[PDB]
Design a protein around this ligand. Structure first.
Ligand SMILES: Cc1ncc(C[n+]2csc(CCO)c2C)c(N)n1
Ligand SMILES: Cc1ncc(C[n+]2csc(CCO)c2C)c(N)n1
Ligand SMILES: [Mg+2]
Ligand SMILES: [Mg+2]
Ligand SMILES: [Mg+2]
Ligand SMILES: [Mg+2]
Lengths: 295, 296
């Protein structure tokens, strides 16, 4: 708390050279094992382009409707590998359609896990058991079998801890606020327990991800890739965990921070902008969420 | 930390008697110095009904476009009292329109406060100086005059700490994520600094407000006022988004009632909960905590 906090107003363009540090490339999809997780909300992004870059696609219940309604390109060319959840939102017509086309249906009635977490368990269990059994999900407990199987396969130590996964999550932010918060909560929890799983929330307004404790280097070919020709893209660093405060040091943002303490009920960097033409750096005393405006 | 955490599954309908405690009535606007603050996003709700119940209406920059574009039955009958911000989003056409109709224009170029906080300062200063001077905002510092004039006077001098205000904020949630978080951050900050100011974020999906440390009693005529007759009961969540953690919760009237239940980010968080109380419910918390309730 001794070091003086600083906020440096930088020029609109700067060249930041690469800094062990955490390297983040949020916009590769706009050019590891890629996964597309589709939650329940209208799909506005270029679904097709994202789909083509993913190994598996999972729909979280109502998310299947969102996928279905997007084509009304041939709908039959994009069948989700898995459809997971309590199914209190997916419509029979949509359910029938995809089931007849081969989607692996996994019903989980548990009222203690949401469609997002259930879908996440499905994804993790997939990369652990699918190469062994195509129907690994069959006959499992219909209440919370995924949850039990996941955090239970670790007791037998049959879990491959080494596998880099990138999960692109659609429709998880922006809707009901408690769902947005649970999604962020899971983002933090998942990094704590599964640091090799990288999650990107792609929304209508921005891309949201997690900066890891320590140095983070975020790169991209150029800002034009995600910001059509404001002259510069906006961003924010959001201290939403139970670890507070967070000490930030950035290099490449319009309002660069040095030994700047951030915390909810304190100062929070919002409406910041990106000056780095090819990348920027953010060092943090603990994991922290970052959002970057897209288009 | 010793008491056992409990989650009690309750029937879909329960009768909760009132509890000394914080009484919250989030839906009276569907059923007091009311203020309507409009940020920049398309207006989906029944604007006119809310406007009618508000004493003052403020547009945060682009929020003026949102108000203007809403009438695309007479736009001229709804002129905002103030239009505040750096004005990078408001369009000249809209700006000229309301200007000519008497809206009080308060430009603040400061790049260290957003349109929301600037609008909040304007609202607080209004209830302090407006009754004494109609054009109190004139000639103030155009960079951060509102910010300096407020807290710079919020010190035992002219301020009148006794003033109950209810601010209804539109378009503050659901847009760019950093704006959503800054809004929630301010929600927390405002309560500790200005406890008599009650804020309600009205979004396309729910109403969001703050539960105060201690006992909270949320009441309404019936769940029908905010939940049209797939799901029989309205959804809700208790979100621990402050730097005070963990929060111990004790609820009476939710579908999944909590007892001695510790909530925190990176821990367990109550989401997709539901309201069983027919006329209200109780939530006791060890510290302020955010609550959202589905509106449909
Ligand atoms: C670390 C840091 N983050 C953001 C801002 C300023 N930012 C916050 S509000 C606003 C104006 C919005 O109309 C801007 C540009 C800063 N100064 N320092
Ligand atoms: C305190 C508390 N809050 C929420 C839930 C359960 N809730 C969380 S996920 C889910 C199912 C969503 O499809 C439900 C109902 C609980 N059990 N206890
Ligand atoms: Mg569901
Ligand atoms: Mg579920
Ligand atoms: Mg503005
Ligand atoms: Mg501003």
């Amino acid at each position: 708390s001794e070091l003086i906090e600083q906020v440096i107003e930088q020029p609109d363009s700067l060249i930041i050279s690469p800094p062990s540090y955490n390297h983040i490339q949020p916009f590769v999809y706009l050019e590891n094992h890629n996964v597309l997780l589709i939650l329940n909300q209208k799909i506005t992004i270029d679904l097709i382009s994202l789909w083509k870059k993913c190994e598996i696609i999972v729909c979280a219940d109502g998310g299947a409707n969102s996928l279905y309604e997007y084509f009304n390109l041939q709908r039959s060319d994009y069948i989700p590998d898995y459809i997971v959840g309590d199914f209190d939102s997916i419509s029979p017509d949509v359910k029938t359609y995809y089931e007849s086309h081969g989607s692996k249906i996994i019903r989980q009635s548990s009222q203690y896990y949401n469609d997002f977490t259930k879908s996440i368990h499905c994804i993790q269990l997939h990369y652990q058991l699918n190469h062994t059994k195509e129907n690994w999900f069959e006959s499992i407990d219909e209440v919370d079998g995924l949850a039990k199987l996941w955090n239970g396969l670790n007791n037998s130590s049959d879990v491959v801890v080494d596998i880099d996964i990138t999960i692109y999550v659609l429709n998880a932010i922006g809707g009901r606020f408690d769902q947005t918060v649970q999604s962020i909560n899971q983002l933090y929890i998942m990094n704590e327990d599964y640091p090799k799983v990288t999650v990107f929330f792609i929304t209508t307004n921005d891309i949201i991800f997690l900066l890891k404790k320590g140095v983070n280097y975020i790169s991209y070919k150029n800002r034009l890739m995600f910001h059509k020709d404001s002259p510069t893209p906006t961003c924010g660093l959001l201290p939403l965990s139970n670890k507070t405060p967070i000490i930030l040091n950035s290099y490449g943002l319009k309002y660069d921070m040095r030994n700047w303490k951030t915390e909810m009920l304190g100062q929070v960097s919002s409406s910041n902008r990106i000056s780095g033409e090819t990348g920027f750096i953010v060092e943090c005393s603990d994991d922290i969420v970052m959002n970057i405006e897209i288009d």
